[PDB]
Design an enzyme around this catalytic site. Structure first.
Site, PDB file in Angstrom:
ATOM      1  N   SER A 145       3.210  -3.756  -6.819  1.00 44.46           N
ATOM      2  CA  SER A 145       2.078  -4.412  -6.138  1.00 44.46           C
ATOM      3  C   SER A 145       2.609  -5.595  -5.335  1.00 44.46           C
ATOM      4  CB  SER A 145       0.959  -4.703  -7.143  1.00 44.46           C
ATOM      5  OG  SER A 145       0.616  -3.555  -7.901  1.00 44.46           O
ATOM      6  N   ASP A 241      -3.872   4.041  -1.680  1.00 41.11           N
ATOM      7  CA  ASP A 241      -3.743   2.958  -2.651  1.00 41.11           C
ATOM      8  C   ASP A 241      -5.052   2.163  -2.748  1.00 41.11           C
ATOM      9  OD1 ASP A 241      -1.476   1.162  -4.115  1.00 41.11           O
ATOM     10  OD2 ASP A 241      -2.941  -0.121  -3.106  1.00 41.11           O
ATOM     11  N   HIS A 286      -4.602   2.827  -8.538  1.00 41.28           N
ATOM     12  CA  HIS A 286      -3.980   1.514  -8.696  1.00 41.28           C
ATOM     13  C   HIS A 286      -2.827   1.508  -9.707  1.00 41.28           C
ATOM     14  CE1 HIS A 286      -5.829   0.777 -12.624  1.00 41.28           C
ATOM     15  NE2 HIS A 286      -6.984   1.179 -12.122  1.00 41.28           N
TER      16      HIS A 286
HETATM   17  O1  LIG Z   1      -1.163  -7.646  -4.051  1.00 41.33           O
HETATM   18  C1  LIG Z   1      -1.814  -7.122  -3.108  1.00 41.33           C
HETATM   19  O2  LIG Z   1      -2.353  -5.983  -3.277  1.00 41.33           O
HETATM   20  C2  LIG Z   1      -1.983  -7.848  -1.770  1.00 41.33           C
HETATM   21  O3  LIG Z   1      -1.343  -9.095  -1.761  1.00 41.33           O
HETATM   22  C3  LIG Z   1       0.035  -9.084  -1.455  1.00 41.33           C
HETATM   23  C4  LIG Z   1       0.295  -8.733   0.017  1.00 41.33           C
HETATM   24  C5  LIG Z   1       1.402  -7.964   0.346  1.00 41.33           C
HETATM   25  C6  LIG Z   1       1.660  -7.622   1.671  1.00 41.33           C
HETATM   26  C7  LIG Z   1       0.813  -8.046   2.677  1.00 41.33           C
HETATM   27  C8  LIG Z   1      -0.296  -8.808   2.353  1.00 41.33           C
HETATM   28  C9  LIG Z   1      -0.554  -9.157   1.031  1.00 41.33           C
END
Ligand SMILES: O=C(O)COCc1ccccc1
Ligand SMILES: *[C@@H]1O[C@H](CO)[C@@H](O)[C@H](O)[C@H]1NC(C)=O
EC number: 3.1.1.98
Length: 340
Positions: A145, A241, A286
């Site tokens: 994640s 996702d 998820h």
């Molecule tokens: O954890 C999440 O699902 C999103 O936040 C992290 C993120 C990662 C890449 C780009 C934007 C935000």
């Protein structure tokens, strides 16, 4: 069980100034080391971080961490649960910096919170070298994640750190799970750009030099940062996702939504065409690689533990041992092995 060690350099801290740390289980008969980055979104301003401190405090502080944790999935030491790397040295690095592992800023008179994720990774690596990492043949930096995006942001810096410290024989590789996102239009990026300023966030150097000042947010998106990386990286990503669909504002499906979802899967598949080591099932999920039943999903008849083993062999195409596994079917659960 993995045992907690708080960092000996107490100036490398979680958001609230408490020491950061890592959980470790050693395997003295193995030269393989797995360092796993936990996920859990992020916070981007004072008010948003204050709310996270009230109800997600373990993601901002070490004060309440337990002395041990159980390794599960790819962190399990049982061969039946982890056919890939069950005998490896196992490290779990808790996410307590709320910065997608990108920050390098301390608490001070001007900063209510510290954002030190990039420095936490470097200090964990440094302190592990005296606990056996100096003898490693492979260091796999993995994560899920926000931790999967953290792999993309930090794998090349770990490789450079070990070279500069004098350990050129350690092969550094990355495994990014559920951290490959699209900056697409919603069904019905501003926060990351604000977050980067708030955290003093850092991105990989070649990507930084392509996008230049004010545009470093682009390097948080896998399809833009991946081609700039020198270390080998394996990408695991569901085509549908749940975090992607949540930010896209998607929750008896009519034509407009059907077309939106099909186009999302096609775009994700397109971004992976030139990623030789990847595992992308056509599922709405998820779920992550530290779950105990991570062995269950297959693409084209091959599980993820097998594909990772084939990747290891490739880094020494292979007959019957594939490494590029991307579903082509266009709707969630068209793969029968999707998590239930
Ligand atoms: O954890 C999440 O699902 C999103 O936040 C992290 C993120 C990662 C890449 C780009 C934007 C935000
Ligand atoms: C502790 O970490 C900080 C931040 O990375 C660094 O400036 C300092 O040199 C470190 N201290 C030691 C003794 O390595």
């Amino acid at each position: 069980d993995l045992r907690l060690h708080l960092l000996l350099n107490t100036s490398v801290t979680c958001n609230d100034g408490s020491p950061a740390g890592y959980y470790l289980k050693e395997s003295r008969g193995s030269r393989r080391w797995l360092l796993f980055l936990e996920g859990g979104w992020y916070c981007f301003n004072r008010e948003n971080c204050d709310s996270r401190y009230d109800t997600m405090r373990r993601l901002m502080s070490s004060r309440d961490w337990p002395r041990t944790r159980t390794g599960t999935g790819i962190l399990s030491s049982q061969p039946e649960e982890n056919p890939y790397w069950w005998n490896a040295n196992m490290v779990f690095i808790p996410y307590c910096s709320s910065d997608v592992w990108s920050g390098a800023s301390s608490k001070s008179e001007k900063n209510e919170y510290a954002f030190m994720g990039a420095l936490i990774i470097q200090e964990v690596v440094r302190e592990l070298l005296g606990r056996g990492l100096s003898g490693a043949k492979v260091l796999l930096l993995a994560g899920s994640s926000a931790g999967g995006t953290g792999v993309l942001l930090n794998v090349d810096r770990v490789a450079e750190q070990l070279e500069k410290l004098g350990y050129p024989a350690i092969q550094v590789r990355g495994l990014a799970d559920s951290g490959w996102f699209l900056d697409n239009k919603q069904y019905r990026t501003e926060a990351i750009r604000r977050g980067i300023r708030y955290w003093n966030g850092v991105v990989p150097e070649r990507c930084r030099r392509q996008f230049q000042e004010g545009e470093e947010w682009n390097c948080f998106f896998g399809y833009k940062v991946y081609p700039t990386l020198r270390s080998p990286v394996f990408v695991v990503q569901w085509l549908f996702d749940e975090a992607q669909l949540t930010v896209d504002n998607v929750h008896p499906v009519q034509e407009g939504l059907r077309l939106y979802i099909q186009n999302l899967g096609r775009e994700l598949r397109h971004t992976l065409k030139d990623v030789p080591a990847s595992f992308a099932p056509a599922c709405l999920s998820h779920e992550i690689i530290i779950r105990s039943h991570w062995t269950d999903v297959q693409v084209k008849g091959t599980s993820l533990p097998r594909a990772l083993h084939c990747w290891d062999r490739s880094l020494h195409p292979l007959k019957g041992c594939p490494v590029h596994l991307v579903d082509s079917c266009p709707w969630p659960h068209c793969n029968p092995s999707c998590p239930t």
